């Protein structure tokens, strides 16, 4: 699985509404409604199939 550091961002994620539709989106430790009201420190993306 591929790990990718993420830094110096602004987590808009409204751009994802336009095209991509996600079957599952589960967040642990954070309620998803608050994801706009926060700043994230050590962000890694672990990608695979």
């Amino acid at each position: 699985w591929n790990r990718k550091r993420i830094s110096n961002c602004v987590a808009d994620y409204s751009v994802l509404y336009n095209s991509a539709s996600f079957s599952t989106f589960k967040c642990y430790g954070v309620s998803p409604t608050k994801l706009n009201d926060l700043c994230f420190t050590n962000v890694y993306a672990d990608s695979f199939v």
Binding site: Y17, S21, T24, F25, P32, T33, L35
Partner: protein, 49 residues
């Protein structure tokens, strides 16, 4: 809605449907029913209603 967004019909969710179209309150008493309707609400060429 589409199938992938049925998860968004729930308290405390976010996404297209849960922010721009239909929002449920946190202190929600009641319940949600959803069923696939491909043989009714989808036609060849695609319903755009």
């Amino acid at each position: 809605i589409r199938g992938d967004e049925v998860r968004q019909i729930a308290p405390g969710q976010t996404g297209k449907i849960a922010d721009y179209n239909y929002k449920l309150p946190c202190d929600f008493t009641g319940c949600v029913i959803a069923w696939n309707s491909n043989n009714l609400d989808s036609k060849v060429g695609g319903n755009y209603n």
